[PDB]
Amino acid sequence: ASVERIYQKKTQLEHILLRPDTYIGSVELVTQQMWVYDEDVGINYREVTFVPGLYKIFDEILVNAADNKQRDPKMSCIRVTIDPENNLISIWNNGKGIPVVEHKVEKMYVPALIFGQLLTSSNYDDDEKKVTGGRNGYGAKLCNIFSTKFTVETASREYKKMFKQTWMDNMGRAGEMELKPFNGEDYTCITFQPDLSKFKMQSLDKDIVALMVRRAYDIAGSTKDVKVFLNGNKLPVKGFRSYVDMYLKDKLDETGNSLKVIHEQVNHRWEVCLTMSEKGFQQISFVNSIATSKGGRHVDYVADQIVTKLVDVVKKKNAVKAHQVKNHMWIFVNALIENPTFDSQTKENMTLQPKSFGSTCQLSEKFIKAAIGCGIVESILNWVKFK
Amino acid sequence: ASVERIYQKKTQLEHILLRPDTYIGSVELVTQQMWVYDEDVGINYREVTFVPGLYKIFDEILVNAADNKQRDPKMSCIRVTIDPENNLISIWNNGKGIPVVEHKVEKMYVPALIFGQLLTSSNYDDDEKKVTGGRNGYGAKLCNIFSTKFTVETASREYKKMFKQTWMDNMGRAGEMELKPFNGEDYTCITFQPDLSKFKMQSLDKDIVALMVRRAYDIAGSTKDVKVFLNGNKLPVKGFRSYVDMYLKDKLDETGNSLKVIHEQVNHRWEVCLTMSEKGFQQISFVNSIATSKGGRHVDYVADQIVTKLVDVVKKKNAVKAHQVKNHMWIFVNALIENPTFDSQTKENMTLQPKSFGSTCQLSEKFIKAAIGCGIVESILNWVK
Ligand SMILES: Nc1ncnc2c1ncn2[C@@H]1O[C@H](COP(=O)(O)OP(=O)(O)NP(=O)(O)O)[C@@H](O)[C@H]1O
Ligand SMILES: Nc1ncnc2c1ncn2[C@@H]1O[C@H](COP(=O)(O)OP(=O)(O)NP(=O)(O)O)[C@@H](O)[C@H]1O
Ligand SMILES: [Mg+2]
Ligand SMILES: [Mg+2]
């Protein structure tokens, strides 16, 4: 009844733990069909039960690793370790480390600042037109906050130093900072034990591991010239087309014939695959190696030029609407977008208008022709016949 | 390229202005089809060009007014003023005012705290199972931050005082707090001048007004026993079914016949209308008077029990998929949900699972029967043939 009990102020850290949803997604169970990678089965679509926020904190660190390839093209490798019985995840990358030096304005070492303080980022100057996935200065701190133990190790040959420090108890405490002389090949390694109590979980079970492994395959398929290892084993992905092939390799439509798959690497920032869908519009897409599971204007931009060209082919053969065409399409898009926007930190839907992408993606006349002859025009014409 | 230039830390306020999208949505132009209310023809679906974030800061204040009906059910009225020429918006409501008193913990007057300080809310104790739209403690400060001038006035007969304070320059400064004795009918009035430069706009033009006006119609239809006024004109909505009718006034399908509409007020927290769609699945829904324009589990919870009963009807008469059924559905849902969750501050998609809703919505067998007899079972059954 008290004014002080009714009206409350929260610190930023308190607010994240109290209201996790707009930061990392739901911290409750969801049961739905998802693409996952099962041991001994590979890529497959099945019902899974998982906590989105746990999936996301892993994603934040993984995308950070991919981002470093854009910062340093000499980077060649990402190594992911998932150890359920010790509740341990590690993500390692090479290329240039984080400067191991005191930040003259914030008065702490750079790695401690950008992993241990909210709203810290190298991505706050949008006069630079970057195709990194990082935008907001939260992601790594979010993983820290939802971890019981969160270790940052980064080595900077330029500064001849190596940094290592561990946070604990939801970024509430930090152990001792370790600084050692260094003169090798740079790397960064983030090792964390997710706070499964925040997710009402007891361990990294089969389903969340299958999702995390598939996400590592996503990275292998969406990045260029980065080898990806999962628990010491190299992942056999070479390019986005070979990644898409894992989804469609033996796939048949419902009459029994194999799916017709249309591909174009339109340019160095856009790659597209199209086939037929029997369950409504489907899209699997990436922006700067972020899995945009709810799509966005990058998907609309590519799909719409297919749809309008197909509605024009169907009209020649007569009343059909664009949503009808789109419901027969399964599209794959891998895109690099400058300074993308999203309506949430989880970055599931990319909202930037095409005029601001920094590149274009006009599908070739070769691609469009093959799209006309891939079964979508057929199914539509049988429906208007059977009217 | 110095380390201090590369790696930067932002205050919360700086971060909101630098990265508005996760707080209020896009601050750039968007062109798409929207339901609006034009001073010409009324509710209608047409292409508009508008800035989502400007639309959103208006919504935050409007939903706050609607929230006060849950706080004080004797509240009866909301009045909205939109004045493009002076770039001024006001939202007024009656019912209980904000307590005009010094907060013993934060050591400022309550209205100053909850309109001038980030992460402040009456909605942070989830042991109270409330059906208010406010959850995060941002909305009103976001409107303040994206305004050149932002004025709060609230009168509390209980505290026998009236409060008034004005912020300016993106919540960068505040004027003086004005306190006067008060002994009339409580009210709260929020008046703001949106910072149109932040939205790269020149004035509150035709399209953004039509969106704001339809949103005021939304409030009149989603709330109970609240009259809604816009520029002194009462909005002629009484109950959710009458609001849905404004969408269905032009009631003809593509065959020429009048639209068949199935309705049920399931309980005090759920009201559902269903009609047919020829443009794919459509949903218009609200959670605690939030316009959930991207839907959510409240929509799924309702639509799915319609779909599953229809899929069971087509089997009797035969391989059909659920998306096929859904594509012929245009559904309206007005729900009150306890402590809802959302993907983003903009609250366009409600993510809370049904087991946590705090109520159920099992559609009546009469509703289901009428839904079986609406043409959706018909067209699909000829399709499988
Ligand atoms: N593996 C890494 N290698 C090099 N720099 C890194 C790495 N991970 C993080 N960083 C740096 O640490 C900063 C903070 O990371 P993070 O908190 O994830 O924010 P962000 O990536 O910039 N934006 P976001 O992820 O959208 O919230 C980044 O901006 C990078 O400068
Ligand atoms: N018109 C109003 N009448 C009464 N109380 C109000 C009114 N507007 C705001 N408040 C109070 O001010 C607080 C701050 O509002 P706001 O910043 O919108 O946060 P919120 O509504 O609690 N959550 P959110 O909108 O999801 O960020 C609310 O929790 C209310 O208690
Ligand atoms: Mg990041
Ligand atoms: Mg609010």
Residue numbers in the entry:
A (entry chain A): 28 to 345, 350 to 418
B (entry chain B): 28 to 345, 350 to 416
Please share excerpts from the published article on this structure.
Topoisomerase II (TOP2) enzymes are essential regulators of DNA topology during DNA transcription, replication, and repair. Topoisomerase IIβ (TOP2B) plays a role in transcriptional regulation and is expressed in all cell types including post-mitotic cardiomyocytes. Both isoforms catalyze the reaction, where one DNA duplex is passed through a transient double-strand DNA break in another DNA duplex.
Topoisomerase IIα (TOP2A) untangles DNA pre-catenanes during DNA replication to permit chromosome condensation and segregation in mitosis, and is primarily expressed in proliferating cells. We have been unable to obtain crystal structures of nucleotide-free eukaryotic ATPase domains, and to our knowledge none have yet been described to date.
